[PDB]
Design an enzyme around this catalytic site. Sequence first.
Site, PDB file in Angstrom:
ATOM      1  N   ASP E 130       0.809  -1.209   0.000  1.00  0.00           N
ATOM      2  CA  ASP E 130       0.000   0.000   0.000  1.00  0.00           C
ATOM      3  C   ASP E 130       0.844   1.261   0.000  1.00  0.00           C
ATOM      4  O   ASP E 130       0.337   2.333  -0.347  1.00  0.00           O
ATOM      5  CB  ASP E 130      -0.916   0.027   1.223  1.00  0.00           C
ATOM      6  CG  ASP E 130      -1.997  -1.025   1.167  1.00  0.00           C
ATOM      7  OD1 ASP E 130      -2.409  -1.400   0.051  1.00  0.00           O
ATOM      8  OD2 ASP E 130      -2.464  -1.446   2.243  1.00  0.00           O
ATOM      9  N   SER E 155       1.554   6.834   2.226  1.00  0.00           N
ATOM     10  CA  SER E 155       0.469   5.862   2.177  1.00  0.00           C
ATOM     11  C   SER E 155      -0.574   6.351   1.193  1.00  0.00           C
ATOM     12  O   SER E 155      -1.049   7.485   1.305  1.00  0.00           O
ATOM     13  CB  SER E 155      -0.176   5.655   3.546  1.00  0.00           C
ATOM     14  OG  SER E 155      -1.318   4.824   3.432  1.00  0.00           O
ATOM     15  N   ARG E 156      -0.940   5.498   0.239  1.00  0.00           N
ATOM     16  CA  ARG E 156      -2.027   5.844  -0.662  1.00  0.00           C
ATOM     17  C   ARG E 156      -3.353   5.996   0.063  1.00  0.00           C
ATOM     18  O   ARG E 156      -4.279   6.597  -0.491  1.00  0.00           O
ATOM     19  CB  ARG E 156      -2.161   4.784  -1.754  1.00  0.00           C
ATOM     20  CG  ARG E 156      -1.026   4.787  -2.762  1.00  0.00           C
ATOM     21  CD  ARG E 156      -1.443   4.140  -4.072  1.00  0.00           C
ATOM     22  NE  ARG E 156      -2.261   5.031  -4.891  1.00  0.00           N
ATOM     23  CZ  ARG E 156      -1.909   5.472  -6.094  1.00  0.00           C
ATOM     24  NH1 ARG E 156      -0.748   5.105  -6.621  1.00  0.00           N
ATOM     25  NH2 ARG E 156      -2.711   6.281  -6.772  1.00  0.00           N
ATOM     26  N   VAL E 157      -3.464   5.481   1.287  1.00  0.00           N
ATOM     27  CA  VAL E 157      -4.732   5.532   2.003  1.00  0.00           C
ATOM     28  C   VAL E 157      -5.082   6.968   2.362  1.00  0.00           C
ATOM     29  O   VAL E 157      -6.208   7.428   2.141  1.00  0.00           O
ATOM     30  CB  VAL E 157      -4.680   4.640   3.251  1.00  0.00           C
ATOM     31  CG1 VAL E 157      -5.868   4.927   4.146  1.00  0.00           C
ATOM     32  CG2 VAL E 157      -4.660   3.182   2.843  1.00  0.00           C
ATOM     33  N   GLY E 158      -4.131   7.693   2.928  1.00  0.00           N
ATOM     34  CA  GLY E 158      -4.386   9.064   3.295  1.00  0.00           C
ATOM     35  C   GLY E 158      -5.226   9.176   4.554  1.00  0.00           C
ATOM     36  O   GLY E 158      -5.540   8.194   5.232  1.00  0.00           O
TER      37      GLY E 158
END
Lengths: 464, 463, 48, 511, 220
Positions: E130, E155-158
Amino acid sequence: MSSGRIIQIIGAVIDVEFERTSVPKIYDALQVDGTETTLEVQQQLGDGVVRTIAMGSTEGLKRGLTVTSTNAPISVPVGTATLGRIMDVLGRPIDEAGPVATEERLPIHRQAPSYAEQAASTDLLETGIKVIDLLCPFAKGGKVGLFGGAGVGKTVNMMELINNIAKAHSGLSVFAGVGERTREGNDFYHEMKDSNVLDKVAMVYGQMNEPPGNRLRVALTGLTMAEYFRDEKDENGKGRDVLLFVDNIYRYTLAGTEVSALLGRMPSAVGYQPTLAEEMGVLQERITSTKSGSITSIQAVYVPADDLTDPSPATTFAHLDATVVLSRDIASSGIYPAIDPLDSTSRQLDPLVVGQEHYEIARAVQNVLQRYKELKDIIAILGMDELAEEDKLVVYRARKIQRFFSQPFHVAEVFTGAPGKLVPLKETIRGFKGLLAGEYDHIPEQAFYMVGGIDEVIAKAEKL
Amino acid sequence: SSGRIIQIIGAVIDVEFERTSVPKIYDALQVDGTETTLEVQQQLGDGVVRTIAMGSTEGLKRGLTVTSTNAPISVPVGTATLGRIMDVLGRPIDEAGPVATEERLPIHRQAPSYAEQAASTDLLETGIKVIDLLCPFAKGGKVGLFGGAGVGKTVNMMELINNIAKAHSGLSVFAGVGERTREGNDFYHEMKDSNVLDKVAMVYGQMNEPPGNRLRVALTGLTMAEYFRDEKDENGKGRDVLLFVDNIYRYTLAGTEVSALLGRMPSAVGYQPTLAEEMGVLQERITSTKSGSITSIQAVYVPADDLTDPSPATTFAHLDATVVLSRDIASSGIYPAIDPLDSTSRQLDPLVVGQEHYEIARAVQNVLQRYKELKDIIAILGMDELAEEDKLVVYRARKIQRFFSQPFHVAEVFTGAPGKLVPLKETIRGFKGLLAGEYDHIPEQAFYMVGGIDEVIAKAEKL
Amino acid sequence: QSARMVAMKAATDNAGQLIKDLQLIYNKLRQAAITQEISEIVGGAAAV
Amino acid sequence: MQQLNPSEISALIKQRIGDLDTSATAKNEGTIVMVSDGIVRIHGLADAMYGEMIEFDGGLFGMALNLEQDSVGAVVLGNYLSLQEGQKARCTGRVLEVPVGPELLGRVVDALGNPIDGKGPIDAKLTDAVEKVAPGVIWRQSVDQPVQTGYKSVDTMIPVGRGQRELIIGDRQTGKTAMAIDAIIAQKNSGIKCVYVAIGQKQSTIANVVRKLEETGAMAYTTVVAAAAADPAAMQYLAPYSGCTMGEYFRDRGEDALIIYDDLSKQAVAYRQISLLLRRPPGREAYPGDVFYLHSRLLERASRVSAEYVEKFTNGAVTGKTGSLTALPIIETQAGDVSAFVPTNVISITDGQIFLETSLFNAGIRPAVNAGISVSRVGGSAQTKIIKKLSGGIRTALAQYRELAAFAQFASDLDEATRKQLEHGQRVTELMKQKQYAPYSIADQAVSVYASNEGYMADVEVKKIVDFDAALIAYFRSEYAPLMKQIDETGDYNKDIEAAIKAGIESFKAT
Amino acid sequence: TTVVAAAAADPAAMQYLAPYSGCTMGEYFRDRGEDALIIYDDLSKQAVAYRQISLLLRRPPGREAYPGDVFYLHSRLLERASRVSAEYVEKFTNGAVTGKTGSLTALPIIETQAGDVSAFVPTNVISITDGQIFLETSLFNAGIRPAVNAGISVSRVGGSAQTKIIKKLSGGIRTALAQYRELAAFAQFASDLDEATRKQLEHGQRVTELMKQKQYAPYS
Ligand SMILES: Nc1ncnc2c1ncn2[C@@H]1O[C@H](COP(=O)(O)OP(=O)(O)OP(=O)(O)O)[C@@H](O)[C@H]1O
Ligand SMILES: Nc1ncnc2c1ncn2[C@@H]1O[C@H](COP(=O)(O)OP(=O)(O)O)[C@@H](O)[C@H]1O
Ligand SMILES: [Mg+2]
Ligand SMILES: [Mg+2]
């Protein structure tokens, strides 16, 4: 009965079978029956099976086709008539001016020269070029490292070298084109012809339009040519001492890598043939002088990737004796030749070789040229008259030196008029020593330009 | 009954046996002719087995009969082996006749179970300023010395032996693995000059013997140690174990020598892909158990000074204390040449060495780190082009470097000066004062190859 | 002005030195990379 | 399935069809099968031994390499172009022998005891097996005895003891060969033995060295073995072993010797070529992993031994003498390749090392000795008491000096301590130089270093100082001849002797 | 908590298979509407061991002696780690649980040589994950404990996985870090720059020191 038949063909490598009672030895010569192509034994595969390479194109060929041997390695014509003649690796004329006159044939290979024949002395070749003659004297039977790009008169320098060696020392000249490009080869021919020197040189080219084996063996071809001429004795014995010109030995190493790869053998550290040093040496040891006659080598050297630590130049330096480098700026400064008189290195640069005074003189010249070189930047930036007048004297004297090291060439005579001047040592030495004494600090730099010995320089100076 | 040779290559041999009886994977094999023994390697099947040599390879001809012992290599063990020097087979070479013990133990065994794992958490000083500050030891821990060629590894080993083993009471074992014989003879004579020669037991495998002997040599000594750690003290748990190994890397090299000949394809580099397994089986036979405690000292050669060759990296994860030497620093003349930066010890928290010690260590480390980053700019610009604090930093770090040079009672052969065994208290006091800047008016040379801070002041005044 | 001039000269000289250093290391690294990759290739080919 | 065995030959198959056993006289004679590049696979010799010399119907010899289930692989000893399969070879039963003894002195010979000088067929009383292992540890003896270089720098910073091993290393034409021959000439009264091996060199060069040793009379206690580049690879790869075997003779008589290994690097190259030609999988830089073992097997054989060990080698023939053997290796690097693989391996084995810097030689400093990376692990045990006392930290001081000077190249705010340190370091630097073929007596270095430590030289000119030394020695040998006579007869430092030296120094400074 | 042990001297396949079993337990919790977490310790040893195993099988080697499928291994490993719909597990439990949804986070460890990122296994795992979390040696040597390098770890999640307040706050912090990182090359010359730039640098220094923390000492 030596007729064997093709059994397998891939690319350039060739396989044949023979009778298990009559098997050719390695490096024997095989002529294909009914065609003019030739096969070269590489390794005995047992069972009368032999793996060989071909010499040229491989087309149309089909298996089971009969091939004979010669029971001997490759032999080529050798003799006096070989001059002015361009042959292949097989010593077969390509000038298309009739066959070769001689019937004398010698096998290409022979063992290394005997330890007993290494001459118990080491002396210097005389040349009249006034630059190597002081800074990088050649030994007798030495190897000269040559570097620099094209267009700086490489051919011209070779011209002059040949002229001098044939003229004074009655030397004979052999040239080998390894991996040659045809156009420059033809130009070099026409130059051999116009400048009346062709009649004294033996020429063989291997083009980069040929399978590698051709290119590998042109080397030994020219080598044997030179060997025959040297061992050819003169009146009262003492066969000539000859010079050998070979282009881009790096190309030679590359072709060796070629054939090793085609044999399916693993590479080396960089990827050369693991046997690299073997062929390098085999080339080298047959380059020397003897108790009878002598041989000396000029070899064009190219450093790929500018790596002084690459295996190929490293192995080269293992046999190099003198280094000569060619400049671009110096030629652009209208100085010919453009030999950098600061990078050229000679193993022979020792008071035990050129003598005491000669050695010290050369060292002093080197010091002066260095000193002026680091002077240059200050002269450029902070003006000129802000320095020691002794340093200015150094500047003038070094300028005179540089003006002087160039000279007319006897080959330049046909080029632009202005017949060249032959000059030995013991005058160059004296003139340079006097210059170092500063006894000529009353003369413009012009008297040193395009001129022979110091006597000529003073003649011009008085006349100027 | 018996088998015989089929082929010989280097140290790898093959034997043909009847399907009725084929040897187990590890068994001693007696060449029925000359004096040579063989160790089973693989079950090549169809009555074919592959093995390694334990002596020279000569006189051996394809077809000569050979017998099995049905038993792997078992060497004598016990106090009778102490004060003695035996071969890789336990045979005496010290010309002291046969060893008077008949106890025999194999060279192979299983790693100690997890349930029996014991933890050492008890400090161990060395009297060595840079180490005792930057690399504390636990009595029974795993300590390794990393270092390239000639970087003084061996000297450090002798110094540690001098400053620990002599002060230690109890037995001790050290073995060299592919070493220079001169040092071995010298070291043996050295203990002979001392009187601890009885306390130690001695083993050699050197870079002069067939690679098979080079291979499974340390196994003997570590087995000695296993015996001793497991030997119950008379009315108590066994005395501690002093272990010292030379050039563990040579083990991996010996494996490498034949790895190809086993028909194994090469690993990522010429190394054997098995590397990690034979590394670990060695390493896990070194832990200290509930019974007994083993103190492991390992000098590790570094090929081409490449810390990240597979072997140093893989070895690296099996030690609590890390000690690496830097070639340039030695070239800068300092001894010992221990890098302040890379060398670490798991005993470095304030909960073990004391809050104060940890603080001082952190501070000096950070100073050195800072200087190291700063070092490049002065190569381009003048040092004056830096902030004043930066110049302070430079001088502080340089004088620290000077202070690390510690004369040793072995180095007098090189120079002549006596060693220094500085108590940790003096070290910590001196470093607090230095990072207090109490000496920012002292020439750097007053710190070089000296003892305590008091000696630094004495030197400076002698300046 | 004089001091600045001299310092610039010294900077040029140090730049040349570092250039030599980097060039040498670059040659070494190129050699090493070639070795590694050719070893990889020959091993992979030998696999069959 | 897999490839054919290079032993399944229709002739052999038909023969086993006729009858399986009694093959080739119980395998006393072998017939060649496979031919390439001095490498020969042969069928039918089980009586043959690994590592055995192999005779040929060609009159040549072969080296046993691979004893296998059906065939044998061997390397050719000499040129192989005169070969083809279907020829006869046999097993001698002797294993890799070579003549050795006093008769070898002053001869130029092949790596097989073959006279290449053509000065008469060389004879012998004894030959010996080439491959052996070094003796046991309880048989070695601590090195304590001087070896002379006639070199100021070497003798001062790097003592050399008999039986130790010290690497000389540098770049091409840094005078390595020069250092070696100096060492050789430096032995003309020591009564010790010396022998020279060269690898992959030009025959012309070999002859140069030969004639130099001739005119110097060196061809009276020495022998030379040649591995030219033209020579077959195996010849070069084996020659150092033959040299070791020849040398050990005298250590086996409780006598010391020095053998000069030239171009061990090229030897390594040749052996690597051999291994690859045997399809041996390579590692880093294509060298097989055994290169470390390769060299170690050679190196460890030369050393100082216990007198009882040789007395065991003798049958009581010797009443107990210290046997020893010193060697000198040469390694060539590529533009400061000090961290290079092979040299690193070498250092791991050597007991001492000497490295020469290229630019200083180009800067004229000869010998251009990097005092920094130059050590002798034995230390002072290899020199007379005089050198022991006078020396002791000078090399380290020089290294620190050069470090400071390197750091001071952009510093101009020196105190007086560092300024004087740099001055003195420069001083000691120019001290440490001499010309080719300039053997120093020990007293030379003694008085010189004493004066240096006594500030009689910081007061003089960085240039004139060399004259300051030459004339000093001239003065001293002119005047105090019995004093140096005695000390170079003994190498003993006494306080009265020191006072006499001080008297000589002051008298010179007075002149 | 639970841990499975594959000691260094254990049989190769044991290491080679252990992470799969750990994943089995993690899923088992996930398939009960629950969520949990596992830690993967140095997949590097696992990869090397699997290499050894494959090589013994005379398997066709690849770059750095690695067969290609090592990718496939790691992929199908980490692929198993994710969060599921409540419906999925609810029907999996056959309606035994309805409300909760299943989830599972995992953390693998990759060891670097000289901090190189172009290495094969690092290349793969980075391409899979991720996002990166990175630590630099010299920062730990710079006293930065932990020694996170925010310049590359993302992190692509943010903020979607952050609560309101922390997402509300983190902005200016990230901005200041970016500014300080911007002026790194001139950090050693705070004598001729802009005053406002000096203020930004001082703020970055303070927040940098703010990012220090001890060990075993987590924060609410
Ligand atoms: N101490 C010295 N003083 C003056 N000249 C020296 C000294 N040492 C060496 N030389 C000179 O250096 C030259 C070349 O050195 P030398 O030929 O010994 O190098 P080498 O070891 O043979 O290297 P290579 O194997 O590359 O030829 C010699 O001609 C010699 O005159
Ligand atoms: N404490 C010291 N002081 C001065 N010199 C030392 C010291 N320790 C080692 N040396 C030098 O370093 C070298 C050590 O080599 P050694 O330890 O025997 O081999 P290795 O380090 O390769 O195992 C010696 O030559 C010695 O001169
Ligand atoms: Mg060591
Ligand atoms: Mg030489």
